Design an enzyme around this catalytic site. Structure first.
Site, PDB file in Angstrom:
ATOM      1  N   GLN A  10       0.847  -1.177   0.000  1.00  0.00           N
ATOM      2  CA  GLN A  10       0.000   0.000   0.000  1.00  0.00           C
ATOM      3  C   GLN A  10       0.892   1.240   0.000  1.00  0.00           C
ATOM      4  O   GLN A  10       1.832   1.328   0.786  1.00  0.00           O
ATOM      5  CB  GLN A  10      -0.880  -0.046   1.250  1.00  0.00           C
ATOM      6  CG  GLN A  10      -1.712   1.175   1.519  1.00  0.00           C
ATOM      7  CD  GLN A  10      -2.668   0.963   2.679  1.00  0.00           C
ATOM      8  OE1 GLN A  10      -3.644   0.213   2.569  1.00  0.00           O
ATOM      9  NE2 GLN A  10      -2.387   1.617   3.804  1.00  0.00           N
ATOM     10  N   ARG A  14       4.212   8.434  -2.059  1.00  0.00           N
ATOM     11  CA  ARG A  14       5.562   7.880  -2.099  1.00  0.00           C
ATOM     12  C   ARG A  14       5.732   7.070  -3.378  1.00  0.00           C
ATOM     13  O   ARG A  14       5.754   5.842  -3.343  1.00  0.00           O
ATOM     14  CB  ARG A  14       5.804   6.977  -0.884  1.00  0.00           C
ATOM     15  CG  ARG A  14       5.955   7.707   0.445  1.00  0.00           C
ATOM     16  CD  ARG A  14       6.010   6.712   1.597  1.00  0.00           C
ATOM     17  NE  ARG A  14       6.281   7.341   2.887  1.00  0.00           N
ATOM     18  CZ  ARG A  14       6.186   6.715   4.057  1.00  0.00           C
ATOM     19  NH1 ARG A  14       5.820   5.438   4.100  1.00  0.00           N
ATOM     20  NH2 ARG A  14       6.459   7.359   5.188  1.00  0.00           N
ATOM     21  N   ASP A  91       7.752   1.907   2.813  1.00  0.00           N
ATOM     22  CA  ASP A  91       8.927   2.652   3.256  1.00  0.00           C
ATOM     23  C   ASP A  91       9.919   1.680   3.886  1.00  0.00           C
ATOM     24  O   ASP A  91      10.865   2.088   4.553  1.00  0.00           O
ATOM     25  CB  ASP A  91       8.528   3.704   4.287  1.00  0.00           C
ATOM     26  CG  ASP A  91       8.071   3.091   5.597  1.00  0.00           C
ATOM     27  OD1 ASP A  91       7.550   1.953   5.578  1.00  0.00           O
ATOM     28  OD2 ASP A  91       8.220   3.751   6.647  1.00  0.00           O
ATOM     29  N   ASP A 184      -3.256  -4.099  12.226  1.00  0.00           N
ATOM     30  CA  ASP A 184      -2.493  -5.258  12.696  1.00  0.00           C
ATOM     31  C   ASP A 184      -2.839  -5.708  14.118  1.00  0.00           C
ATOM     32  O   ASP A 184      -2.723  -6.890  14.440  1.00  0.00           O
ATOM     33  CB  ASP A 184      -0.973  -5.028  12.550  1.00  0.00           C
ATOM     34  CG  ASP A 184      -0.533  -3.648  12.993  1.00  0.00           C
ATOM     35  OD1 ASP A 184       0.644  -3.297  12.756  1.00  0.00           O
ATOM     36  OD2 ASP A 184      -1.359  -2.917  13.572  1.00  0.00           O
TER      37      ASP A 184
END
Lengths: 251, 250
Positions: A10, A14, A91, A184
């Site tokens: 996802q 960026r 990232d 999560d």
């Protein structure tokens, strides 16, 4: 496809980053396909650019999303054909060596979250829980530390859990959207209730580099405890490393 | 006996040493009882008792050098599901034992130990015994181990009963070759579970206060002939305790 995994990534704001990661991940052994959850709505997908720089080892499916939600990657994508899913934040750069090893571990523990980032919950007052890492005192009265969660942002887990996640109480669905995070933590709860075992297993990374709303995380744990009427997370102090990699690491 | 283990140990002329190690092991949590097999010729029992009291019962059993060659005996005194086996020339920290036992509890059908070893083959059907000095047989990087020695290991007591049920050819082989029960045990365990016979747990503090490599190579091949197949499965799983030592996860 029976011996491989699908990478779900996802991204938002960026792009130059995404492409760099993709160049890396596309080359990892056992990777069956990549799904790039395009969260930049009203924006031209990088798919044309990606294809222009082909050929690539595996198919990459770019998917523009309705809104800009977190649980979007937790959707059940019809294009996922593998039993194992690899979820990595846009990232984070995890070495091929780490992925190949962790995937082989997941194959032996298909029903658990195999990952590189362990976390835990603690309690110093009955019924109230808090979220943290190694900076927090261990729960067990014994040696070392404990972890009761493995973040999905750098892990391998069964694709069936995504379908299982969709069937969770709406209360949970709300919480996720309400905090635009905590996914999560909801997954770890889900997995452990389903298996009766610690939700995941920590695999120590040899080469993982990064190019959490702690307070909301704690908040979410307590909320979730209500919804599920209890705290199901199980502690574990198992840390797996690859035998002989680095060389002579066993002694 | 529930959630406890029995320590089975062999000592060879070293009363001073034996009692030293015993003073150590008697205080390990979850220890239910100790069984000491010693080579007869006066026993250490009287001395041990004179320096009592002790946390758990220690049973001394006199044996000839002959029978002792066999570490895979079935002692009626063992009342626990798990057994800890240690050479009388090895000190395993209580911390390693407590952690290793907790791993055995989650994989009670595997040999949870501190000494990994492997078999290799550079010619179809012909195997060799070894450790990390030998090239990995496995896929890519790192190394592999297909065995976990029983000395310095925790394992199901039932496997001792299961051993007794192995073909006569195995029993004869073991009695003929010096050690090699290690090989037999690892063969036996993997055949029974379809999984790697053991899981290597990295020791933090284990000290040695003889491996007949060639003979073990010989036994592997003999056992391959006897069972008509090589069952040993490779594994590169190394387990360590999260947070012990502190911050060891990073």
């Amino acid at each position: 496809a029976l011996d491989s995994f699908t990478l779900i990534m996802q991204t938002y704001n960026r792009t130059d980053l995404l492409l760099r990661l993709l160049n890396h991940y596309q080359a990892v052994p056992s990777l069956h396909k990549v799904i790039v959850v395009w969260n930049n709505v009203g924006e031209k997908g990088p798919e044309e650019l990606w294809n222009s720089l082909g050929p690539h080892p595996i198919p990459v499916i770019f998917k523009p999303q309705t809104a800009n939600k977190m649980r979007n990657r937790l959707q059940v994508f019809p294009e996922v054909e593998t039993n194992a899913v690899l979820m990595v934040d846009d990232d984070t750069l995890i070495s091929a060596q780490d992925l190949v090893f962790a995937f082989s571990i997941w194959q032996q523990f298909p029903d658990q979250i195999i990952g590189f980032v362990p976390r835990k919950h603690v309690s110093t007052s009955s019924g109230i829980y808090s979220y943290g890492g190694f900076e927090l005192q261990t729960p067990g009265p014994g040696n070392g530390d404990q972890y009761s969660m493995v973040l999905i942002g750098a892990s391998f887990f069964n694709s069936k859990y995504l379908e299982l996640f969709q069937k969770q109480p709406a209360a949970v669905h709300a919480l996720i959207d309400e905090t635009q995070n905590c996914d999560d933590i909801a997954m770890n709860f889900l997995v452990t209730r389903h298996t009766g075992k610690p939700s995941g297993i920590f695999v120590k990374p040899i080469n993982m580099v990064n190019l959490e709303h702690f307070l909301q995380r704690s908040y979410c744990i307590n909320k979730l405890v209500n919804i599920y009427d209890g705290m199901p997370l199980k502690y574990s102090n198992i840390m797996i490393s690859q035998f002989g990699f680095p060389y002579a690491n066993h002694k």
